[PDB]
CSV table of C-alpha atoms and ligand atoms in Angstrom, one decimal:
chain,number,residue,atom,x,y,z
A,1,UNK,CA,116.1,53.8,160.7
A,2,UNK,CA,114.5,56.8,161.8
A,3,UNK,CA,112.4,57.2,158.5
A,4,UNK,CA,110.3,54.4,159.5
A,5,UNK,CA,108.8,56.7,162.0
A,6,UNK,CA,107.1,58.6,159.9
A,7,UNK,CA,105.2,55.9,158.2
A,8,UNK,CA,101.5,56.5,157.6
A,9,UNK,CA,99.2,53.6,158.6
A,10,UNK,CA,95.6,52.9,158.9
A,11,UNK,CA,95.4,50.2,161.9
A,12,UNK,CA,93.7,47.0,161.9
A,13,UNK,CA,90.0,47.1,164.1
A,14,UNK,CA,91.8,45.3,167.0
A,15,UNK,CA,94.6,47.6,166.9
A,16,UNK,CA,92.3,50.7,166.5
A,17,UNK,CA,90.3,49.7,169.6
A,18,UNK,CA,93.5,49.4,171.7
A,19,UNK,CA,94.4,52.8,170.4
A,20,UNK,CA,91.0,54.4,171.2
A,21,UNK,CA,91.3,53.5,174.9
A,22,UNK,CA,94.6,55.7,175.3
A,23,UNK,CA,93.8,58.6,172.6
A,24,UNK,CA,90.5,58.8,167.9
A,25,UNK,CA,91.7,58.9,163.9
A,26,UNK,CA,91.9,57.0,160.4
A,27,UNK,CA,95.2,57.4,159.8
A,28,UNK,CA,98.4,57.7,161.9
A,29,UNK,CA,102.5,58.0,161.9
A,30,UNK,CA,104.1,54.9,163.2
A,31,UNK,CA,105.5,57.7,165.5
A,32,UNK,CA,101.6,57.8,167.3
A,33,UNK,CA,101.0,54.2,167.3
A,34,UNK,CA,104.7,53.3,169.0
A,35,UNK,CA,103.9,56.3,171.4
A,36,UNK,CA,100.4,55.6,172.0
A,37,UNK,CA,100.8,51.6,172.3
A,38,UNK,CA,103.8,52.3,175.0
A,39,UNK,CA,101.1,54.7,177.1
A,40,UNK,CA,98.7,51.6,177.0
A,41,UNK,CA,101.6,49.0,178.3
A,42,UNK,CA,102.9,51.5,181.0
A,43,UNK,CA,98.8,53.1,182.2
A,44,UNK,CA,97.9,49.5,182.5
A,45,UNK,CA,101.4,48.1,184.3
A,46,UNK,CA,101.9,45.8,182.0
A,47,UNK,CA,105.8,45.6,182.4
A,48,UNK,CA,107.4,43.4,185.4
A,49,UNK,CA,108.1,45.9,188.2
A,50,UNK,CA,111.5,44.3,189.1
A,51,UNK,CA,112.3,43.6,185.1
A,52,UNK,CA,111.1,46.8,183.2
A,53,UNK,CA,111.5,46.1,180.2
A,54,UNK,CA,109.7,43.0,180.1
A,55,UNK,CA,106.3,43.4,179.2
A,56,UNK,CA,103.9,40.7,179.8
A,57,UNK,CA,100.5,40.2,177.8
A,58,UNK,CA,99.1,36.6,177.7
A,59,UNK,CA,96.2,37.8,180.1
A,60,UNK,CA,95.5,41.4,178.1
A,61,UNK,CA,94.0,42.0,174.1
A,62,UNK,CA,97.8,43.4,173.7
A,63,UNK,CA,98.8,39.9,173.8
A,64,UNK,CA,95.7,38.7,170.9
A,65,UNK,CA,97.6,42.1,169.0
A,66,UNK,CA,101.0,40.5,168.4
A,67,UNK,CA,100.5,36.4,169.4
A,68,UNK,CA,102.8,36.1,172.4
A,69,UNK,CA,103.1,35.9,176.1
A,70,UNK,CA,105.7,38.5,176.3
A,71,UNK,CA,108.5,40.5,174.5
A,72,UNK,CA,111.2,43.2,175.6
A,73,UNK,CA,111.2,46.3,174.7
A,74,UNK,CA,114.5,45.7,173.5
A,75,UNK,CA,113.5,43.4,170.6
A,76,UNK,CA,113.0,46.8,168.5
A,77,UNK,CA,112.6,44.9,164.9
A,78,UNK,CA,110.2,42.0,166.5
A,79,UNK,CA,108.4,45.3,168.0
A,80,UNK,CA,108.1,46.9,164.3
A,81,UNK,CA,106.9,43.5,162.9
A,82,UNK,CA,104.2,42.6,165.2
A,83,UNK,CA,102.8,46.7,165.0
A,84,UNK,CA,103.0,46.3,161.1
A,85,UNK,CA,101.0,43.4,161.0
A,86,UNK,CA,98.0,45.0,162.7
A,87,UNK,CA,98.0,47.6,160.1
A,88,UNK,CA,98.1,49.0,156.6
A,89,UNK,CA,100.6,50.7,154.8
A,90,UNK,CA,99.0,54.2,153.7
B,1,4TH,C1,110.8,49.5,168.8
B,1,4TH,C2,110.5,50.9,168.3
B,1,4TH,C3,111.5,51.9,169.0
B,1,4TH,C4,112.7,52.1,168.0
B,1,4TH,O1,110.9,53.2,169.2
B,1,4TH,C5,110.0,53.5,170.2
B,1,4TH,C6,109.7,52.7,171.2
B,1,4TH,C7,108.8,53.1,172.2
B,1,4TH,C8,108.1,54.4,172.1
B,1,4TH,C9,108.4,55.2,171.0
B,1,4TH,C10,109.3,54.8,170.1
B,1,4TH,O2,109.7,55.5,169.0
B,1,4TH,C11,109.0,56.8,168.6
B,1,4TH,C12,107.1,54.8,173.2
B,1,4TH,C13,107.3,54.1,174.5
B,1,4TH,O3,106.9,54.6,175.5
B,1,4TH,N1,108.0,52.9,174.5
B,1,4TH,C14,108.2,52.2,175.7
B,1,4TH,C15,109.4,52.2,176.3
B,1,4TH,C16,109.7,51.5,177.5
B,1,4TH,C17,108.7,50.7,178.1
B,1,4TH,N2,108.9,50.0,179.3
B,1,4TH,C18,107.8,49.1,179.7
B,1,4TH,C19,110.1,50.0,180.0
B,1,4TH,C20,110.2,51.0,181.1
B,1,4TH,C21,111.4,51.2,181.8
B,1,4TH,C22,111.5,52.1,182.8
B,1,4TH,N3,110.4,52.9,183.1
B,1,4TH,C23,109.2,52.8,182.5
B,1,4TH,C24,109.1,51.8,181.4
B,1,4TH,C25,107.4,50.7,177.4
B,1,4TH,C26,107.1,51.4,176.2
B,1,4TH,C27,108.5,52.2,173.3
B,1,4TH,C28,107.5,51.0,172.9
B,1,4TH,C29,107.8,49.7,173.1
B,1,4TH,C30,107.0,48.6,172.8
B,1,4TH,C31,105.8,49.0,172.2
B,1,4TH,CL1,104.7,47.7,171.7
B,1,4TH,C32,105.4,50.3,171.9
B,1,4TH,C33,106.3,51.4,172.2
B,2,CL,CL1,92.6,43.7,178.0
């Protein structure tokens, strides 16, 4: 659902120092964090050139973030859950 977009959160210190190295607030939309998180994957490379929409995070703090070696950006509900556990609901 679109609505969860709009969903103000206050992120967890790990989460807010990943943020702070691609943009600097309290509280944010789920909108920012999806938008600033994907900035941080794609600035870094972290996404196999020949398969793009694997990204791959054992050897980066994204990987401490949300506990595995990988994901696809496909897996759009397993994206939401591992984001909502590094923050608060506002
Ligand atoms: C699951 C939520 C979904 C419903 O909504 C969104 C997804 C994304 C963005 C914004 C969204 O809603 C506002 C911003 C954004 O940029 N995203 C992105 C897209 C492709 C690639 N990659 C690596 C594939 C890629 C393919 C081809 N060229 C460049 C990259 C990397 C990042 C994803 C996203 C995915 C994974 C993570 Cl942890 C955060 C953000
Ligand atoms: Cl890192």
């Amino acid at each position: 659902p679109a609505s969860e977009q709009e969903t103000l959160v206050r992120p967890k210190p790990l989460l807010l120092k990943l943020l702070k190295s691609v943009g600097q607030k309290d509280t944010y939309t789920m909108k920012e964090v999806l938008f600033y998180l994907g900035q941080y994957i794609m600035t870094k490379r972290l996404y196999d050139e020949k398969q793009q929409h694997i990204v791959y995070c054992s050897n980066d703090l994204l990987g401490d973030l949300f506990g595995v070696p990988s994901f696809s950006v496909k897996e759009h509900r397993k994206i939401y859950t591992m984001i909502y556990r590094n923050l608060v609901v506002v």
